[PDB]
């Protein structure tokens, strides 16, 4: 229908340059996908209370950040219980029912060259408190990012790390940092007081390139919506400056005061809900597909190859979704990637695999609880089934939608080889 | 994991460049081509290449279609040049690395205002015989095509059309030909006696485009090796026109006079084979791809999705091949519209499929006669390692190499929608 | 490497590292922002201008000077506020400032004077207010007029009518506000000198969410159409009580200057703030960054594509200097002027290379600042006897200029664009320079 | 009715597959023909009466073959050809000046042979204006036949032969000290396999494109015409695509020296390469030479590329240069622009040896001086206009773009200038 090519910025879509696609950009052409940005919110006195959680996992948080920088120990465990608390009470319903990831933040290093003794209990705690993701303050070498790792222990390897950057070091020696942290974060606090405040875009706009270059999650942080800590609505730089981080490549966007200690705490997961979901609409696929594909190499990896091909499929036919099996992300995560327009829905039975695929773009996870069926196929199709059945009851697909189906030929991690083309019936 | 050599071979170098200019600056005549030629050649049979014994050093040599030329000689000669070339054929079914299908093409004497009486018996006598091609001359308009379709009487739906454009009409009226055509034959020897002789290129590169638009096979045809009627060798502007056919984009070549009565028939399959081998590795596969990508709308059938996304996978790993299963040849054909590096291994149980798949460019024709399986998933597998065997014993395939497998949900043709990734064991 | 190595061996590596040049040279948009690198520093003079609003924070004469030697290029008159008494003492202030520069021509920097309407409020069209402003306006020689909510042609119509028969140099920005201008856009465009993109009032009147559409929208057909936007509200807000902006501020600016804003603005900053001399730095800075930033090979590939062929030999001899420029990495484009036209052409393409206007023009010399890149110089001699040597004089004083200014070195490569005869309409002239 | 001929709609085509699919036979060729003809001198096309034909045919470099014939009879021919040449300089405004090149024997079975050190003194002692130098290998080849034309022959232009695979995988090192590159087909087709001699022509060709050098496609391009008076499919074929791959030159051998139809095999080539050069995707090859050319701060470089991006927006009808060494012509012809490069010379010499850069189209400059320097190049540029005018490049209402000086003496283009005609 011709009302399906004017929605989600489809005229500027298909512009032959990106400034006949700026020209095309349409204040009249409403947003269809889901949200793809992932909103990380920092916990804290504004947003503790567990029936003030559930209405920010209703307004789109995707991951609870919490900051070690302040409160004990103790104050954490109970914002981890809260946090849990408010998003098991959604588990009744398994088709709606979203994950939400528990990241741990550190206070960092202080005036010291390494890990500092403090971080090395935190991360003790978040071991033990199983949190899926530790942002590690300071990242100033590779040897930083080990050490962290080395703290985390032999319990705490499934943990990602983000590295964040904060400071000159950590940006000279980015590539370094990134090849062995599973992400990053753009910390435009510290970095906007170790560097010229007028150089950070710079910095921020390097990193996510280099990130989206290397199919790694990048967060972008600080101040993104600051005046709502005290005001009802942002301000025009604010409202820029979500809808530039999430056209930069930005894979999440995050919250600081805004959530941990302001007054519209829930308001301020609604506007970057809102905004990011007009950004990424607005983001000009044809020339970004083509550079991903040219600069990515060569590869004899199964899982690869068939998430290229899964891409390419869904642009050609304009997929509603790309339903994807995965145990630990990776499946989902290297088809987000590519930054297809259609919707990664990943079907897992690892929890916390669910709550950490929320760093990659696009990636909406899907927690089945079912016990394996005794036929591997009838299981495979069962998953397959609940992601198109969840999917339905959420808005991402209706009847006569093609949808792309990523799966493997074995059971187990790393056998993801086959790409489907299936009508929702 | 693949080696320097191999990224100096097949004009990968070249491959490899951002533009087409660094792409012509990089070809080496020192890289070696390794894939199998995939330009289709077409011989004339006559008097020089009619007898079995000449036939079978013919196949040797690479001859895929045998033109029968219906402006000279009885239905009585016609019916033993098609019973010899049958017998040449079938005098390799003993061994697996020698038999290849053949097909043959009728060629009409042609026009009065449309259908001849002579074309009518000879369409007839095509259908009684079983060829599996008609190349109808002086094709005008639309029309013309359909009297050459309702000729083909009840038993020959399935035989397909090659329109022959040999005059201003027909390059006129191209768009409405190729419509209702099932390919094209460029055929220069009247074009270039009905329109100027120095205009014939642009009509070749013009109809070559558009069948490569369309994804409809095109031949290039007429004194493309004439001199070596009557000389062992051809000269250097004969070499440069068979090159330059194949990187214009056509899916076949042929042979006249250089097959029918000239004295080096054999030879002259033998030097388009080696300079279609040499062209073929020179294309610019980087721009041609990106063209037709951009330039074929999207689509919601699922054997045309599937299709972009196996070649998509193919060149994201430099698959040795892609294995598809065919009936009517149609998944076959969507694959090699997108020029894929990687050879297009096509299994099939229809024996006119596999000679007709000939007229498709980079499409190697397997015919597999094994009764079918009780098990329909089993006959499928059977048929996918029939093509992965067939390509170890001819040189396309070795173990560790990637392969990507195209097949359909269900039997039946009109199903495709599976691409697999496989290593090869 | 082959493309820029014999230049390499010739200026040096420290010349191709400077000015984001690495991520200049990239062949994709993606590897762009992977080079973009914190310690590549700007070299070029500053060239989107910047706008301090005029009030109780920035009137005096003293505190005049002071934004001008930061980098203040047009002064905005707000008529929502104040009366006619108090904005000719600022525009005597503001005059008073600039001209205590005078003193020394080749450093002299003009200023333009814009007067921002007061709206229309709740009537149809122009306010008897608007009407008495606009003639206020006139007789005090402004330079710009903002037009506020502006809907459609007839109301760019209304205010060029208002201006009168003396106001016809004068130009017109038009302020887009609301859902009517957006989607009225082109016809508004077309007669118009520019376009505001006034985020504020836009913010309320569509989605706060959808601004950003209709900021990158306008920005992108007036880089199309060759005419001045302007991107302002709220841009270094934080900065009226703080004495740094916020992370958000900071990249709103870089993002204005990328997205392909001429101008950008500051109001409160500037007009009430407590530091209105350190928000005309910091815009001044974060542009001079974002500036070096700006992926030129795809910006310049796609303004050709887009723009249609044309047979004016003004436009032809623009773009031919701005590929020499780029061709050459030539410090400066040095353009005669009667109206400001000839160095618009010029910046329309957006040259890496600054480009130096000299005119005789008081006028078109303060309104060129709306023309991103075009820094213009007052040549205040009178004509010599031969046409040819007072051409040739005019290009001396710009090579004097943009010596004394750091502009240009010995060395240095210049395009000098001229034309046949004298008045206005008549550039059809590239040269090559070599500055000894 | 303009923006249909010269296959203007497959040149505003988006993409290469989009191009070839608006190619139209009925598009008409309006441009005057760039690529120049090399037509071989022999018992075909010797005489004077059959010279003045070739020369309103198209030929404009004539090829003398040292490998057969004595000293004497290559005077002889030489003496036919400038009389024919100069039978047309009574009409100034469309005179039409004749390269004449000599090819080389060869080094056979050792270097320079003895035989080419008397045949190039016998070629500086005759003004020839090229040599085409057999069997280059290597830079010192080139080297060699530079010292063997001595002093008097600095001025003429060598255009090494790649013959055989040394040839082709030194190219490097044999361009960078060459004025040109010839693809001699024949006989590189006996010393590499005859099935890869496209890949050597197409690398040649662009390798030369790239550095701003002429570049010819030699041998057999109509070879069927020797006997008969209509050529091949493969040879129109050949011909054309020798024009679409980026060649400066097309050549005729035994076609114009001992064949039937020398006349008609140089009017053939005349016509399909103006059909070929119309074809040719602009959009794409000056935005790929634009980018691959390296920066520069030489002033004629800088100027050129200015003029030809100037003439392009303005579908200029032609740049019309000053030049004294050809030079500032054969630095705009580097980019192929669509507009015809009219260079006005005093130079004989210069305005022969240009028909070897595409585009080009040397007029010898022989009116009366001008006292005044600025009202001199004026009159040269009037020149320009009026020849432009005759000879149907030019029309009133037409743009041009103008490239001058600001100095006399070569070296020192630093001007463009947009012009309206009358
Ligand atoms: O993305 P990952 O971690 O590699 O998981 C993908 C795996 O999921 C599957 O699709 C389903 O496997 P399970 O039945 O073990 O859940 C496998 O075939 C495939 O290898
Ligand atoms: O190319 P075609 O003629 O559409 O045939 C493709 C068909 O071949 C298959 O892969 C195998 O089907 P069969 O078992 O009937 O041969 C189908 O799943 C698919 O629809
Ligand atoms: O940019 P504008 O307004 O067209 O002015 C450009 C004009 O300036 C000049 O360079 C100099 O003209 P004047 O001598 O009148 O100042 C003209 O040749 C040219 O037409
Ligand atoms: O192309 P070349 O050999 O550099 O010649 C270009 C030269 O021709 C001119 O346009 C005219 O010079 P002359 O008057 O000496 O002929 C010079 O200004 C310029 O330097
Ligand atoms: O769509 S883009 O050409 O323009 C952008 C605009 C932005 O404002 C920000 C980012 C991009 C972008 C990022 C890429 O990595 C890329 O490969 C292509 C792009
Ligand atoms: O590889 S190409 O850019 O250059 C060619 C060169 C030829 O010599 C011939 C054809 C092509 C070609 C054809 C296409 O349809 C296309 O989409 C791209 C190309
Ligand atoms: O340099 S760009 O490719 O990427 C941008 C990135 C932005 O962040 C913003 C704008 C652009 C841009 C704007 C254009 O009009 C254009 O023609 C090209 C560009
Ligand atoms: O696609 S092209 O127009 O771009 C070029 C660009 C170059 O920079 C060089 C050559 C070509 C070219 C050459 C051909 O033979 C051809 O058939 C097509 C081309
Ligand atoms: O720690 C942080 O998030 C920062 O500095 O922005
Ligand atoms: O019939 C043919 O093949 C021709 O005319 O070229
Ligand atoms: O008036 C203004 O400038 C606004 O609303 O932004
Ligand atoms: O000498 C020649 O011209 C050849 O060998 O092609
Ligand atoms: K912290
Ligand atoms: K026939
Ligand atoms: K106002
Ligand atoms: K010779
Ligand atoms: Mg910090
Ligand atoms: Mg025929
Ligand atoms: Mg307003
Ligand atoms: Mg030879």
Redesign the pocket.
């Known amino acids: 229908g011709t009302a399906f090519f004017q929605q989600q910025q489809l005229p500027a879509a298909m512009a032959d340059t990106?400034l006949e696609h700026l020209c095309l950009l349409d204040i009249d052409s409403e947003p269809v996908a889901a949200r793809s940005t992932s909103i990380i919110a920092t916990i804290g006195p504004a947003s503790r209370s567990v029936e003030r959680l559930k209405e920010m996992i209703k307004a789109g948080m995707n991951i609870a950040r919490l900051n070690f920088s302040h409160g004990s120990h103790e104050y954490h465990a109970e914002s981890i219980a809260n946090v849990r608390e408010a998003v098991e009470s959604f588990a009744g319903s398994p088709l709606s029912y979203r994950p939400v990831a528990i990241a741990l933040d550190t206070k960092g290093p202080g005036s010291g060259p390494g890990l500092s003794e403090q971080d090395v209990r935190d991360l003790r705690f978040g071991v033990e408190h199983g949190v899926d993701i530790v942002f590690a303050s300071f990242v100033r070498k590779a040897s930083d990012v080990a050490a962290v790792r080395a703290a985390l222990g032999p319990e705490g390897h499934g943990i990602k790390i983000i590295s964040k950057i904060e400071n000159h070091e950590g940006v000279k020696r980015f590539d370094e940092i990134l090849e062995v942290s599973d992400g990053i974060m753009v910390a435009r606090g510290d970095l906007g007081i170790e560097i010229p405040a007028e150089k950070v875009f710079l910095a921020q706009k390097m990193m996510i390139?280099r990130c989206?270059l290397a199919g790694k999650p990048v967060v972008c942080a600080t101040q993104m919506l600051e005046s709502m800590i005290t005001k009802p609505r942002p301000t025009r730089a604010e409202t820029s400056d979500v809808a530039?981080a999430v056209?930069?490549?930005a894979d999440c966007i995050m919250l600081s005061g805004e959530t941990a200690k302001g007054n519209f705490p829930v308001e301020a997961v609604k506007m970057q809900h809102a905004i990011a979901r007009e950004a990424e609409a607005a983001?000009?696929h044809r020339?970004?597909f083509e550079?991903?594909r040219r600069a990515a190499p060569l590869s004899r990896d199964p899982t690869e190859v068939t998430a290229i091909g899964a891409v390419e499929a869904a642009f050609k036919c304009c997929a509603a979704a790309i339903i994807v099996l995965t145990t630990t992300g990776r499946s989902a995560q290297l088809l987000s990637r590519y930054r297809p327009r259609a919707a990664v829905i990943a079907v897992t039975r690892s929890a916390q695999a669910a709550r950490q695929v929320h760093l990659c773009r696009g990636v909406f996870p899907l927690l089945y609880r079912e016990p394996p069926e005794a036929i591997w196929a009838d299981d495979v199709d069962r998953r397959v089934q609940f992601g198109i059945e969840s999917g339905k009851l959420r808005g991402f697909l209706r009847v006569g939608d093609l949808v792309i189906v990523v799966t493997g030929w074995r059971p187990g991690s790393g056998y993801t080889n086959i790409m489907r083309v299936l009508s929702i019936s």
């Open positions: 990106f390139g989206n530039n056209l930069d490549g983001v000009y020339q970004l550079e991903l």
